[PDB]
Design an enzyme around this catalytic site. Sequence first.
Site, short mmCIF file in Angstrom:
data_model
loop_
_atom_site.label_atom_id
_atom_site.label_comp_id
_atom_site.label_asym_id
_atom_site.label_seq_id
_atom_site.Cartn_x
_atom_site.Cartn_y
_atom_site.Cartn_z
N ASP A 40 9.47 9.05 11.15
CA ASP A 40 9.50 10.05 12.23
C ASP A 40 8.21 10.85 12.31
O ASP A 40 7.69 11.05 13.39
CB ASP A 40 10.75 10.96 12.17
CG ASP A 40 11.03 11.48 10.79
OD1 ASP A 40 10.31 11.09 9.86
OD2 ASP A 40 11.99 12.27 10.63
N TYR B 6 13.22 14.73 24.34
CA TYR B 6 12.80 13.92 25.49
C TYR B 6 13.93 13.70 26.49
O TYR B 6 13.76 13.05 27.52
CB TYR B 6 12.15 12.62 25.06
CG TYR B 6 13.03 11.66 24.29
CD1 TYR B 6 13.68 10.62 24.95
CD2 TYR B 6 13.19 11.78 22.91
CE1 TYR B 6 14.46 9.72 24.26
CE2 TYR B 6 13.99 10.87 22.21
CZ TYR B 6 14.62 9.84 22.90
OH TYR B 6 15.40 8.92 22.24
N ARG C 247 14.43 30.08 12.15
CA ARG C 247 15.33 31.20 12.05
C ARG C 247 15.93 31.21 10.65
O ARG C 247 15.83 30.22 9.93
CB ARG C 247 16.42 31.16 13.12
CG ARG C 247 17.27 29.92 13.12
CD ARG C 247 18.39 30.09 14.13
NE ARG C 247 19.26 28.92 14.19
CZ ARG C 247 20.35 28.84 14.95
NH1 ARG C 247 20.71 29.86 15.71
NH2 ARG C 247 21.08 27.74 14.94
N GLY D 103 15.25 17.82 9.75
CA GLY D 103 14.76 16.48 9.39
C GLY D 103 13.45 16.13 10.04
O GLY D 103 12.52 15.70 9.39
N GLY E 91 9.11 14.17 23.73
CA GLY E 91 9.36 13.31 22.57
C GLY E 91 9.43 11.81 22.77
O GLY E 91 9.78 11.09 21.85
N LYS F 224 19.84 9.90 5.22
CA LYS F 224 18.40 10.02 4.95
C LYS F 224 17.96 10.67 3.62
O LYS F 224 16.97 10.21 3.03
CB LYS F 224 17.69 10.69 6.13
CG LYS F 224 17.84 9.89 7.42
CD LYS F 224 16.96 10.41 8.52
CE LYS F 224 17.31 11.81 8.92
NZ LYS F 224 16.57 12.15 10.15
N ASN G 171 14.13 7.07 6.33
CA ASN G 171 14.75 6.61 7.58
C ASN G 171 14.49 5.12 7.86
O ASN G 171 14.97 4.58 8.85
CB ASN G 171 14.28 7.46 8.79
CG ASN G 171 12.90 7.07 9.29
OD1 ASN G 171 12.13 6.34 8.63
ND2 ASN G 171 12.57 7.53 10.48
N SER H 17 17.94 2.65 19.45
CA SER H 17 17.11 1.84 18.56
C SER H 17 17.40 0.34 18.58
O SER H 17 16.47 -0.45 18.48
CB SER H 17 17.14 2.39 17.14
OG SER H 17 16.56 3.68 17.12
N1 LIG Z 1 11.55 12.13 19.76
C1 LIG Z 1 12.23 11.63 18.72
O1 LIG Z 1 12.19 10.43 18.49
C2 LIG Z 1 13.05 12.53 17.81
C3 LIG Z 1 13.27 12.17 16.48
C4 LIG Z 1 14.03 12.99 15.65
C5 LIG Z 1 14.57 14.17 16.17
N2 LIG Z 1 14.35 14.50 17.46
C6 LIG Z 1 14.92 15.73 18.01
O2 LIG Z 1 14.50 16.88 17.27
C7 LIG Z 1 15.52 17.88 17.28
C8 LIG Z 1 15.82 18.34 15.85
O3 LIG Z 1 16.12 17.19 15.04
P1 LIG Z 1 16.50 17.27 13.48
O4 LIG Z 1 17.02 15.90 13.09
O5 LIG Z 1 15.35 17.90 12.73
O6 LIG Z 1 17.72 18.31 13.56
P2 LIG Z 1 18.26 19.14 12.31
O7 LIG Z 1 19.71 19.43 12.58
O8 LIG Z 1 17.80 18.52 11.02
O9 LIG Z 1 17.43 20.51 12.44
C9 LIG Z 1 17.81 21.52 13.35
C10 LIG Z 1 16.59 22.40 13.57
O10 LIG Z 1 16.73 23.11 14.80
C11 LIG Z 1 16.89 24.50 14.51
N3 LIG Z 1 17.90 25.06 15.45
C12 LIG Z 1 19.04 24.47 15.85
N4 LIG Z 1 19.68 25.26 16.75
C13 LIG Z 1 18.93 26.37 16.95
C14 LIG Z 1 19.02 27.53 17.72
N5 LIG Z 1 20.07 27.74 18.52
N6 LIG Z 1 18.05 28.46 17.65
C15 LIG Z 1 16.98 28.29 16.87
N7 LIG Z 1 16.83 27.20 16.10
C16 LIG Z 1 17.76 26.22 16.09
C17 LIG Z 1 17.21 24.61 13.03
O11 LIG Z 1 16.76 25.85 12.49
C18 LIG Z 1 16.45 23.44 12.47
O12 LIG Z 1 15.06 23.73 12.25
C19 LIG Z 1 16.74 17.25 17.96
O13 LIG Z 1 16.85 17.75 19.29
C20 LIG Z 1 16.45 15.76 17.98
O14 LIG Z 1 17.03 15.06 19.09
C21 LIG Z 1 13.62 13.71 18.27
#
Ligand SMILES: NC(=O)c1ccc[n+]([C@@H]2O[C@H](COP(=O)([O-])OP(=O)(O)OC[C@H]3O[C@@H](n4cnc5c(N)ncnc54)[C@H](O)[C@@H]3O)[C@@H](O)[C@H]2O)c1
Lengths: 290, 291
Positions: free
Chosen positions: A112, A239, A161, A139, A260, A76, A97, A27
């Site tokens: 987001d 991504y 899950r 999140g 992403g 957050k 955020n 960022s």
């Molecule tokens: N493109 C972007 O700009 C952007 C922005 C935010 C988050 N993300 C990506 O989104 C993903 C999740 O982000 P977050 O902040 O919501 O994470 P988080 O820790 O808040 O949420 C985790 C999520 O993934 C699930 N999960 C994790 N491991 C799992 C598994 N082994 N099997 C099944 N489900 C599983 C959980 O149930 C939950 O819904 C991350 O990979 C993050 O890098 C991308």
Amino acid sequence: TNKITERITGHTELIGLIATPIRHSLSPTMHNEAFAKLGLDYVYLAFEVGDKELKDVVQGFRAMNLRGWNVSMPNKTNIHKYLDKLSPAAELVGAVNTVVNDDGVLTGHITDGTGYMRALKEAGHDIIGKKMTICGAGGAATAICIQAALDGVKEISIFNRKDDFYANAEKTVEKINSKTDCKAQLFDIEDHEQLRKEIAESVIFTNATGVGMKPFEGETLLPSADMLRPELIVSDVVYKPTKTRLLEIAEEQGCQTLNGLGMMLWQGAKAFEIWTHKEMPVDYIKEILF
Amino acid sequence: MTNKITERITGHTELIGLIATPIRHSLSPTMHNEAFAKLGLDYVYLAFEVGDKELKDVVQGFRAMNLRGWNVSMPNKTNIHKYLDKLSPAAELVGAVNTVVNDDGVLTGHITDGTGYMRALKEAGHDIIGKKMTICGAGGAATAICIQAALDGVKEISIFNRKDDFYANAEKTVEKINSKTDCKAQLFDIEDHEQLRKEIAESVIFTNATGVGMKPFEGETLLPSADMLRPELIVSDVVYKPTKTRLLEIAEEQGCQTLNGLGMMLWQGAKAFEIWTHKEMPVDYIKEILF
Ligand SMILES: NC(=O)c1ccc[n+]([C@@H]2O[C@H](COP(=O)([O-])OP(=O)(O)OC[C@H]3O[C@@H](n4cnc5c(N)ncnc54)[C@H](O)[C@@H]3O)[C@@H](O)[C@H]2O)c1
Ligand SMILES: NC(=O)c1ccc[n+]([C@@H]2O[C@H](COP(=O)([O-])OP(=O)(O)OC[C@H]3O[C@@H](n4cnc5c(N)ncnc54)[C@H](O)[C@@H]3O)[C@@H](O)[C@H]2O)c1
């Protein structure tokens, strides 16, 4: 010959990023490059700030008269306690955020979800008034589901899950149905027969979980390729890798796909527009970052 | 192999602050950002408008932010010790702090202007240690210089100042010097021209540490007449904008060696730079860029 090369002078102002861990974040490069390009006298910096530091840092920020800043894990959901106002989405999501300081009044925003929805639209994908099936309740999924609802998506089937986030998903459902016109429902990700029906009935299938990303590269929550069809749009918040296992299967099935990259760029643009009332040159930034 | 990321500031870059008001026209950020760039240090220096009502919340916030350090200026120098853990010997005796450094959560306050002034003299080949100095001024800069001078081993210092708000400060400085250093200090009225003539005649250096010579007092000097100076006397001025005050103009004409405040400014920064990074700011390179 030697002359001044640093654009940072006593006039330069600060935009923050407060979270932990956080120093590997992209960022700062995004916003600094954006400011440099537009000739804006701002620099963006990240700080290792957690639960214990948050209250002091924000009071410090008010005192320093910062224009705003980003907020990431683990702040957050707590930062609202030290803010003055919340955007409709931040209040509904229960997460912030992005903060902006207007004449001493701190408003918390959540970008987001906005970024994700924007990236779709820019990619030529219209899901407004249509149905989406989405994996995840963290999140990002939460912000996407709520912003999606607010934007006019008609129906959202959520799959997650039975872990620490399932109860959050239940709130997301309840929040969506009670204070939005979008119809939402929650299902266990292991309910594979329900997953099949929901995907068939959706214009888009989205991964908003860490699956597909380290330490789960090459893994997908999608049980079978035959749950996808050519016209189906398949998207992932991940991504890195640029093509998750889900997006590989998607291409093999003829689906149109989107990782992403767009979402991270446009959530940055949103923050940037909030702070400066200027449009971030995404195409330019995109080139610079990748 | 292309790399368009031309911005050296990333999530790794740390912050060094400057807190005061007004403060946005300050040159310090250019000084340090250029020094950091040149040396490859992942730091950036920014200014913040901080005054009485904001000081406590800012320092508490820099601790939470775990900042490495920062500069402090008007009107916070004398109040900031209240939110610090420890003070350098000079900072405690002077009662002002213009530099802070954070070591493992412990904040130490330092005062580098006096250090900067003395260093500039030494770099310019002038040894005033063990000798006598006559100095004009009783503000922050003069107080820092007198006290540091005494600490460094100046033998005697005659201080001159007009009968304004600062005279009381001078008296206090005299008392500090005489009671806690091995230096002898006395305070006189700047309008006592005959004492001034005598003190200058008995000094190895005459220094202006007031704003006279600097706008709104350009072209003007507290020195009543060239008669009071002589070829051997060293004449220095804290002012460097202009680079050659009326005082230095006259001093040059009288054959004296002169030194403006450009060194004090650079070496004050250098000291700060060194307390924070434990490295040597390349003064020479920075002087080229700044002035
Ligand atoms: N493109 C972007 O700009 C952007 C922005 C935010 C988050 N993300 C990506 O989104 C993903 C999740 O982000 P977050 O902040 O919501 O994470 P988080 O820790 O808040 O949420 C985790 C999520 O993934 C699930 N999960 C994790 N491991 C799992 C598994 N082994 N099997 C099944 N489900 C599983 C959980 O149930 C939950 O819904 C991350 O990979 C993050 O890098 C991308
Ligand atoms: N070289 C450097 O890096 C450096 C550092 C600090 C200050 N300075 C310069 O030094 C000067 C003084 O700094 P300060 O912070 O101590 O100022 P200050 O406001 O704290 O004190 C002002 C001092 O100047 C005297 N003074 C002002 N106007 C006068 C007049 N018309 N006649 C007689 N005496 C007068 C006062 O008696 C007082 O002792 C300024 O010009 C400042 O820009 C230079």
